Structure 1
Amino acid sequence: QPEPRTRRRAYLWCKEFLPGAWRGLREDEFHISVIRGGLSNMLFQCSLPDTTATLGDEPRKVLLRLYGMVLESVMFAILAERSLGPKLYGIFPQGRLEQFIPSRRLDTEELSLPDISAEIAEKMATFHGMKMPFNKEPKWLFGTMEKYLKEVLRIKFTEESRIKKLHKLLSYNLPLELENLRSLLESTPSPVVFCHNDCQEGNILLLEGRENSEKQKLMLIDFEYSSYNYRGFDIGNHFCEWMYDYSYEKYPFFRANIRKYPTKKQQLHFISSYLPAFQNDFENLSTEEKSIIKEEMLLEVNRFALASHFLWGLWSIVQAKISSIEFGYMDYAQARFDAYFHQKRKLGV
């Protein structure tokens, strides 16, 4: 349960924005509980009295999201219209009402289950074929990294620990290294598509009641960082996410495990599912040509995986200065940068 200053707001929003029973519902009939609290993007679960029959096809239970601009909204509406996302039941200046999808999030170690990562591949490829009314020019990747790098070189921390950690990070010569990375990635062909850009296990729902479905038990959510971007980044980033488990209950509240990065075999298995789903003609290609393509895609995504480390490393340093959320951001930054340089050595680039 929430505070008084809300739940009423939540009451009004549900009563005004939802059809059916919601329309005549009394403030004492309103059921609401917290799904995730905090200062920003708070989730809530609102529901009709179980003793209330629905008048039409309106939802019994809904997700309320409180922001705590225009593109984010257009995108969610579109994904909703195409059944790629939760339905959009209502939208307003300080949040929105979304479909409540009975489910849990994936856990890190589940990303490696052959059936799971085969469906994530298939879903990412599908996400990747969608037309969106947004800029098709791949500005996002280096634009965001420059934006973050510049912030980082302006960040001053008070406590000695953060100063120390920032100092060790700045000692990699991030500006120079960004240019080394630009060189590498420019010379690495990767089709521009609509990328989720944050395809981590916490954004993948296992839909309850089909945990037994072999190719249809997952849904991708949270598209807040989505944009047109190099394909290799969405895949590389997701592969990186195999190494990071955010459920750790002690500070810094994540574990990094480099050994958990997908093996070549595991990589070939993800992309062997991705490709058929991304170009429908791929399956009919010559056994030999498929491997030509797969070997190339492996080079492609493992290289862009470096951008995942670099971008989210920088991102993490900024979050440290400004976020309230309890999470060891600097240590995570240090982890992403270690994995960065470990991956460079591994690739010999």
Structure 2
Amino acid sequence: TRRRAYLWCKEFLPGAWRGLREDEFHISVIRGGLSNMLFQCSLPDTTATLGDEPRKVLLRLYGMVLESVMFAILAERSLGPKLYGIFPQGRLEQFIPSRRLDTEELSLPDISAEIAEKMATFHGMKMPFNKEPKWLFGTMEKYLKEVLRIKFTEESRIKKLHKLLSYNLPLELENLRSLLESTPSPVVFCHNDCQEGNILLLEGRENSEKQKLMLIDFEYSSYNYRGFDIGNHFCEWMYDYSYEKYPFFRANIRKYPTKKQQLHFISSYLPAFQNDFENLSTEEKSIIKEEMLLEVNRFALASHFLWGLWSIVQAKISSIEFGYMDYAQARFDAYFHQKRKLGV
């Protein structure tokens, strides 16, 4: 691996990387794990670059074709990290000096204003993928059917899974389908996982007011209802994954964005998504806003439902230390709370 990374870096990267010896190779882990291990490879500080090649790069081990075409495209358009090399068991990507946002930072008005802008821009991109909005319910159905086949060993998971099934998930899915079918929402290229863990604060521009963030990790990206990408992100205000004691997240329902905070986000989103929106009548803009509010708060329900089902699947299979079943139970609690709140 330290050699594998050495070979991949020597062979895929230009400049000093070409003549690099193996005892000159600097690598360290950025994230271990079982799948998608991140690494930081870099030149001797005492090595001068020959061209415009990078000094430090991010390696990503997968641990099919669409994810690669996608990442290449975003790289080409300067929407994503640059792609320096791609191979069967991973790829070399640009290393972006940054940190991830924290949960509570999402509510900072400049941060959520720029996230809205960035998601709007992400949303207007054309991609060579299927533009039929199959993804949302196709994945929920795929997960549900996995869930009604999962058998757990340990009494606790059995107990928890038994509570979740008692909601009558198949019937509840139909009630959700019914509601969203009656809720218009333009299909656009969605990130589908726009949580704080996937938003870079680019270092050196913490002082920029509108250009300090980048969106990354598009493994779930597809054409999907705009409402889901926004409602999902709103849900993510509630969940903090940096908690260091099992179950390794906190949910806080009170942290869901207020009407005022929602209007602030979409008041950024809309002008960045349709460049003619800014010239509409004050009244019309509020017609569109009030209507969008209903839209994304309904699709928020699908965020809860989808990730709840996903969280149950991950329990049975994942190695990652995370209280998946407790998270599923949190997502469904927020699902039913949001139903009562909306009166739907």
Coarse TM-score class (shorter-chain normalised): over 0.9
Mapping of residues 198-237 of structure 1, within 5 Å: 198-237=193-232
Q: Give the counterpart of 2:181 among 178, 186, 190.
A: 186
What are the superposed Cα offsets for residues 166-202 of structure 1, whole Å, 9 maximum, x if unpaired? 0000000000000000000000000000000000000
Cα-to-partner distance string for 1:125-162 (whole Å, 9 max, x where unaligned): 00000000000000000000000000000000000000
What is the deviation of 1:206? Answer: 0.1
C-alpha deviation, 1:325, in angstroms:
0.2
* Matched residue count: 344
Q: Which runs of 5+ in 1 are unaligned?
A: 1-5
Q: Within 1, Cα distance between the matches of 2:89 and 2:102?
A: 30
Which ranges of structure 2 fall in alignment gaps of 5 or more residues? none
Q: Counterparts of 2:339 and 2:158 in 1: how far apart (Å)?
A: 26
What is the CA distance between 1:307 and its match in structure 2? 0.1
Could you report, residue by residue, the CA deviation over 1:1-32 in whole angstroms, capped at 9, with x for unpaired residues?
Answer: xxxxx110000000000000000000000000
Distance 1:316 1:38 in 2: 18
Cα shift readout 1:291-327 (whole Å, capped 9, x = no counterpart): 0000000000000000000000000000000000000
C-alpha deviation, 1:225, in angstroms:
0.1
In 2, the alpha carbon distance for the partners of 1:253 and 1:327 equals 6
Whole-angstrom distance in 2 between the partners of 1:141 and 1:7: 40
**Deviation of residue 276 (structure 1)?**
0.1
Match of 1:225, SS?
coil
In 1, the alpha carbon distance for the partners of 2:28 and 2:261 equals 40
1:93 deviates by 0.3
| Residues in 2 aligned to 1:199 and 1:38: alpha-carbon distance in whole angstroms | 21
1:223 Cα deviation from its structure 2 partner: 0.1
For residues 68-108 of structure 1, the C-alpha deviation after alignment (integer angstroms, 9 at most, x for no partner) is 00000000000000000000000000000000000000000
2:50 aligns to what SS in structure 1?
coil
| Structure 1 residue 342 displacement after superposition | 0.1
Supply the distance in 2 between the matched residues of 1:304 and 1:344 (Cα, whole angstroms).
11
Query: Which residue in 1 is equivalent to 2:233?
Result: 238
- Matches of 2:42 and 2:150, distance apart in 1: 44
Runs of 4+ in 1 over 3 A off after TM superposition: none
> Cα deviation per residue 1:193-222 (whole Å; 9 max; x = unaligned)?
000000000000000000000000000000
Q: Render the CA deviation track for 1:22-65: whole Å, top value 9, x for unaligned.
A: 00000000000000001100000000000000000000000000
* Paired position in structure 2 for 1:63: 58
Match of 2:337 in 1: 342
Take 1:262 and 1:196, find their aligned partners in 2: how far apart are those partners?
20
**Partner residue in 1 for 2:277:** 282
Query: d(CA) in 1 for partners of 2:5 and 2:291?
Result: 51
1:216-243 CA-partner distances (Å, limit 9, x unpaired)? 0000000000000000000000000000
SS in 1 for 2:223: strand
Q: Shift of the alpha carbon at 1:114?
A: 0.1
Q: What SS does the corresponding residue of 2:6 show, helix, strand or coil?
A: helix
Inter-partner Cα distance in structure 1 for 2:216 and 2:284: 34
Normalising by structure 2, what TM-score? 1.00
Aligned partners of 2:240, 2:39: CA distance in 1, in Å? Answer: 24
RMSD of Structure 2 on Structure 1 (CA): 0.2
CA distance in 1, matches of 2:280, 2:313: 46
Q: How does 1:93-112 map to 2 (within 5 A)?
A: 93-112=88-107
Taking the aligned partners of 1:240 and 1:258, their CA distance within structure 2 comes to 9
TM-score w.r.t. structure 1 length?
A: 0.99
Structure 2 distance, partners of 1:320, 1:62, is: 33
3-state SS of the aligned residue for 2:301? helix
* 1:152 is the counterpart of 2:147: yes
- In the alignment, does 2:38 pair up with 1:43? yes
SS of the aligned residue for 2:136 comes to helix
Query: What is the distance in 1 between the residues matched to 2:290 and 2:251?
Result: 27
CA distance in 2, matches of 1:299, 1:104: 33
Question: Matched residues in 2 for 1:213 and 1:16: separation?
Answer: 37
